[model samples]
Target chain A: PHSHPALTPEQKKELSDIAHRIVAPGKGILAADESTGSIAKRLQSIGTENTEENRRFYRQLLLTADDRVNPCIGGVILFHETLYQKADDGRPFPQVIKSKGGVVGIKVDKGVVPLAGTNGETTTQGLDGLSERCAQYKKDGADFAKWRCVLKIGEHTPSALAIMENANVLARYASICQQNGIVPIVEPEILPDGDHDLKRCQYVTEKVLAAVYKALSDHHIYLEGTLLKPNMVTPGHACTQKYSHEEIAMATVTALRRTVPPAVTGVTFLSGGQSEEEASINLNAINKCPLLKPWALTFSYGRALQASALKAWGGKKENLKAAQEEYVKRALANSLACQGKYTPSGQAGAAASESLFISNHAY
Target chain B: PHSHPALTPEQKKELSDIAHRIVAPGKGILAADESTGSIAKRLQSIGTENTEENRRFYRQLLLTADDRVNPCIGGVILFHETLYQKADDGRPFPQVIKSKGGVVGIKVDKGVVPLAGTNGETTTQGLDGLSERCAQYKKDGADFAKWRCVLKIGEHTPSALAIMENANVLARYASICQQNGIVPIVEPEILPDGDHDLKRCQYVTEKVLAAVYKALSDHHIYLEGTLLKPNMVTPGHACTQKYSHEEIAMATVTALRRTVPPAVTGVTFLSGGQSEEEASINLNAINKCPLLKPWALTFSYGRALQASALKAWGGKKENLKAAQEEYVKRALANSLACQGKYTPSGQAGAAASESLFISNHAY
Candidate 1:
């Protein structure tokens, strides 16, 4: 039978447990795995010298957020450098994350590669030597891995080739991760750079995610062993029409319900270009959207969770405590947000509400 | 919005009309679109010179078969070379095919390329400059195009990348074909090349076809303008267990019914590796499967239709009548088979029962 079950029942259980724990209860992920190139921009935004120490210090501030973040951040995704870097007390970052009750996750995809005939579309690359890397990460206190592939919406954009190639790449990544005991977070992020509307984004998201899960099935990746990190269905950045958080929530949940199977452990959304407060509010609306979301709905934000903290740090040593506070505040807000208890607007101050959108955003 | 559909209503109707006519009652296609390299092997098998004259003559024998074939063959898929070639009377092959009430089809895909990270899996190429070629073909009396993308079933075969990449390319090819007034025959053939069972073939077939249609939808290809040329679901070439033709027909019909939308004009199946009589009897059984098949079920046989004729011709002008007779016999038999009236086995000639199974068939 073509039913070559790639995963044994025990393997399925192990990976499923790891995925569930990463989004357990009122929790989400902290995407601190920005490549050195991406983190340089985050540091440059605040005039910080992008040195090794500065990078280590910045990741430390977020990773060591107060105990309140323990319940709020079920997982902390780290860059390769951060995974191996030592904490102030000399504990490895992965160890510290494990010690603080959060699962340690590693971003394994190297980056995106352009598809030759596509209109600015790409499939992620990093599968080369991935199985070995996944095994090493699994042994180094990491329970999960993240691979991000980008797709866009435009006239003849995200062409059929782009969607299928990216989805297949993600599924291949997930399969390799599970074979080595790491739960893979499959993220096919549709960039929010067009002027498309909510329904259009919803349609695109539904189509993209359907291809993704189907590819995963064709690859025989156990859905229970994987998590989806998707963009919350919303209008494009330049769209003229405005939509309520409830509308975005309905679109997001409805799209997910159509494509994502119940076997998937969770759906942790990337905050495409939403501000921290906006991300939180929409996540809350999604939780209360009155649809059956079988998987946990939470955040896997990089900019949304760090914009305020980075601003507060401004590359200063004395502001370390203050920066950690900003990090904790967003984490805690997102915690309640995942449970449908967050109230919108201004809880994290000015910088938290600033638009963090970049055209055709990467990282 | 991202829904920039590729076809207009009028264009959709024109393309749909052509696709429907190609599979209109009791008719299917004759796939003679063998690439030069592929035709070379056929010529070598019969110790015939692989000359252009020989190629043209062989193709003529099939295209100009007696009127008995007029009701059996509705479409003739031609290689790029054959599409523009002329018969002895100087009538273009496309003109001759059209004169016989058959739609002319040009094979558009360049060929297959290796996908780097797969287990010897590949995606078809030939998309570069495809739009221009399709336009010229449409302008030159051709009403349809064929692009074959192959997949195989085995242990960890047809990797996620292969299935997704191939499906997307087929969709892109289909989309471009429709835009230029050519109906695209979406052929995603899974080679019967392993020791897998009927259920396995059915599973992979279902999964593959599902991905193909979803991709067609994503690319906004008008399904009504597209005809499916899929492999008939069957056990692998080396599978131990035997299944009745009825069982194979049931599996084939079930997979199609689940994935192919009614909007698809017809299904003209590729006879992957089945013998002539086996292909005929099975096709007959598919028509009699007692299921709600909303689209036409018929043959798009290449070897299954030509095996006897090629053997009989033996590259001899003296045997031209014998060759033409063999070709007409299969066409007439298949015409009856498609209407569920063909009796089982062995009526045409000795070569009709010879197994055409080749490990990992390419043409």
Candidate 2:
């Protein structure tokens, strides 16, 4: 009653369609959108040099992992370089994803900037030319975009300044994306770096998301055209108290239901420092959750999906086939996990359950 | 669980006491803290020159009001310039105020700054040097500080960026204030410049305060040591709809009771462009409303207290007595208004009911 519609119905429908397609039944996203620096760490872990050719090869393996991944992977998010690079078959990564019936997505933000006067808290900083960039990406074949803003649990942070500044930046980014015919995944990822309990994480999660959605409303963003990528509610990694996958799922879904409006298209959770098994189990539990959910529950995972593949490859050209096989297996597993039908296999590779945590992780 | 105490028990008690005393029984504030640029308009309205001595003369007239004002006014907010200005008798304005049993307050924020990517929404500044300023002000006889961050109701204004930025800044300012011995008056004034109805204003008010208190909670602010300065809910100035004082009062109180914690020491309503008498009547009705209020309800008004006095002074020394009498009248009326005992006077001065609004008012 207080505002005119910010987006036309056609714009709204376009965004909604893109969001729904990424989280369609038995499907989710492959988050290979790590920054160059982030990918360097992943490469260093395998004793490989960080080179454009190597990065392209790694991404190509996951993208071309047989038709078994076609229905399993509804989307693939690429860094700017990967979006322009070609596969071994000479097809652009976006073109390859389109050929497999997966939507093309791009990560479109500069990294975080520190908020002064806060206790080492920060807000994301990619809004300088966001509108023009989104339009250019849309023209370049990106149907969706991602902007990750990090917040953390600490003695005095995610301070009020951090939560508010980050939420607002995400909303502004979302508003710009919807206007440019691209769906925006709103990611205000709260870190799992503290020793706090599940309840404390739940409380911060609820407050942060409430601020996020309220901000979206205030900015006149078209909620029907956007998606949320939140951290699944879990106790801090160092917490003394433990919670089951069921408890994490309950907390995660409860927080979303309380703060996110029903009009939002879907939720694609980020696997924040969780092991592959832990991430898959949490997604399955979230899908099996008994509470009424109006949106899809799926994954937009990075390390959880690729840690095993990276280990299997171990920086050798001879290990490419083995890495692709590992990637395809995880893709098929997560597809079933999103549908709440994944059955764990004892043959899964090593490193699948090892924690991938880095303190106050970015990317 | 996340923070060490930002305020000691003794500091908390002192702040709560100062806040309570500002809105003590049958008392309200006299907000004469108009900035130099702001007071220039007041002087120009009466065709008087904007001279420093003229400004000093006008302020002295209001500060030297009779003992009747001493019991009615519990606090006096002075601008930085006025805080150091002395009465004609060689007593500083802060001393003059303290001698009459009225607490001295200082307005601490610089003016608002536009938020990037918003539809002309702004967040207040002045946090850069607030900590040191508060320490100095506290040592110079000020017991409280006021920082006003405004939000407006519009199709796309008060965007998420504005609300979040403004609320976060206010919380940071509050934390610093309490670290010293100053009680912070948290003011998030929503401008009534649109054609929106009472419900829209109330909706915006509720959302704004919810964000405010949530930020306060996130920042670990001591709520009992702070005071709230909010606009009383009313239809916009340009609105087609009109309502009774009782309706406005009900909307104002209901909005507060829903979002304001019981631990806050008081709720001091800003006049927000309302006429002097109109402001008083609504406040009286707010006190008379059938609701449970856990804190003191009173006024922290600028134009509503000084509009008549400024007109009477007309920058002429011969009219000084006339201005003081007018100032005393509103102070007494507001005192009774806070106690729900104010009775409208048919013989009051003409300016009492005259519109005191300046569009998008500053100060």
Candidate 3:
């Protein structure tokens, strides 16, 4: 709805002031709450069987790891299904996290809809009746909405039509959510598909981000009430050239630093099907790199945070503790990455699960 | 609905061809389809009562009198309700137009959505579920779609955001309709509601149009498959002075010639509440304006076309015949103007019924 008048002029000043405080030097988001489907696939890469109870146990472990983790975790975004799931002791997960002082966000997208004539690409379509959904989620302790519009690379990839259509839709989605007091995470994810190179990805990412912010401005969407959950500009999955964690982070941060509005609350990097360890390391590099970043660098990760947890529990309650522990390790890694305090030596156990997902999943 | 291959291709070709044909030299559109409400408003200005039965009788008569009007009327867009109503002796309105050889079209936009912070400006809406609507209308013999987005002058008149947002929405609307087999008339009307000078109007008009075409291209909207409906640039109501008809024409043509794409099928100027005489004189001047005019610069007026007809009808059967005659006379003038052949001598009747919709209506 209307921004908190309760904030008063002083509070408004404080909010803007805190935004700067939080993103001060080395920070960006780590997308820790990769969906169940994404995490399972990551486990599959390491030959680990995947299951739901296991996923819950894994996530519980991550949430309970340490209070010190909150300093690195500005906001822990959850998939719709994860927002309510509890850890051991029947503690409400949101309460557990809030007790430790972490902002909890829920993913609200309804998945993607195919562009009628595009090259196997799609635009997200959860917008039909989204207003009510946002209002309900807000009351349920959700502070944000995330709908991702995926763009791909091709001779005609990220077609102007697709870019404009998706950007406008995202703007509309954000405008509605903001009116209901839910901050929106505007994610226009350019899929790392095709044989696109890192430079091309950087170019496309910059253009897409520019268009998205412009669209949001056009809709009068308050920038302070919006966040950016974007893909790190990496070479396409098929690109044989491997990049250093530092390179990925540098590319990601630089692209965002250039185009994302300083007013945006934060820039959370999607795992983009990167391996758990890889995602954290990339985010770590993104934050640690010598670049002029203007937003909080932290994790809103899913796959990177949950893959090991899924494997450790295998959906069985018997393995809940073990699963939760696995989740914590990933979470801690990302949290440290958010603080730019990660050391490559920290991702001790999940290092072997790099190829976590199936190739080019619709996710 | 799937676009019928043959129909879509042919319609695409026909529109592209027609657009090229009409802009061949000095030809343009002659918009003469004002709605009953607008026509009544016009007639009311002339002290005539508005009525439904009289409105129909007047329009029917106007349709018949313009037997040879097709040469100048490449397309005649009807209000939503008028498209289905029958003429005398039960001939469908569309059939009568086809019989007269003009491309019969329909106004599909619901109206404008107010730009959140602009000066009473609005973007065209009605796109919530336009594809199905366009397909069904196509099945019903409608070949084109018309949507008009209105912007007005004030201190912050035609704000860049308003221009951008409206242009974007219009382009998306046009592109989607084209995919479903409808040649769309992309009209972003800058309303004549200010006291600004003519050059200011022209400056805003040029910028608005440039943005529109850029958006159309950005959306991959096939310009060849679309048309433009814009306002004729002129001074505001409170201006200290007025420009010659030729000067108005020069400003208008120069604006269109600069921003409109060469591939666009036509440029139909909305009379934007201009006096019938001014409308015709402006059209004539635009056509006669020495310039590199490439698109069909014609009229796609509403009130300018129907005011006299409404006045003649005056809610009386006795006035129906005269109303129709008056309509035909104006339509004929527009048709002639589309060919750069209209003269100012016999159009004093139109100037005689000047409107009061705005202080400087059609400035």
Q: Which of the two, 1 or 3, has more DockQ?
A: 3
Candidate 2 residues lying further than 4 Å off, grouped into runs, are A1-363, B1-3, B361-363
Which residue pairs clash within candidate 1?
A2-B200, B110-B126
- Kindly list the per-residue Cα lDDT of model 1 for residues B1-363, writing each as its tens digit: 244445667988899899989999989899999988988998999999988999999998888877888889999999989988888899989989988889898898877754543566767766555667888989998899989898988788777667877887787678678878999999999999988999999999999999999888766678888899999999999999999999999999999999999998899998877889999999999999999999999999999999999999999888888988998989988998889998854467778888988775442
The TM-score measured for candidate 3 stands at 0.69
Tens-place lDDT per residue, model 1, A57-167, is: 999988888888899888999999999998899999998898889999999987875453346666666665677788898998899998989999887877776777788
lDDT of 3 at A11: 33
lDDT by residue for model 2 (A269-331), tens:
899888888888889878876678888889998888898899999888899889988888788
Docking class of 1: incorrect
**The best candidate in terms of TM-score:** 3
Ordered list by DockQ, greatest first: 3, 2, 1
Model 1 quality (TM-score): 0.56
lDDT of 3: 0.69
lDDT of 3 by residue, A29-81 (tens): 33445577766666566455666665565567677766545565555667777
Per-prediction DockQ comes to 0.03, 0.05, 0.08
- Fnat across every predicted model, in order: 0.00, 0.04, 0.11
User: CA shift at B142, candidate 2, in angstroms?
Assistant: 1.0
Give the fraction of true interface contacts kept by model 3: 0.11
The candidate that wins on DockQ is 3
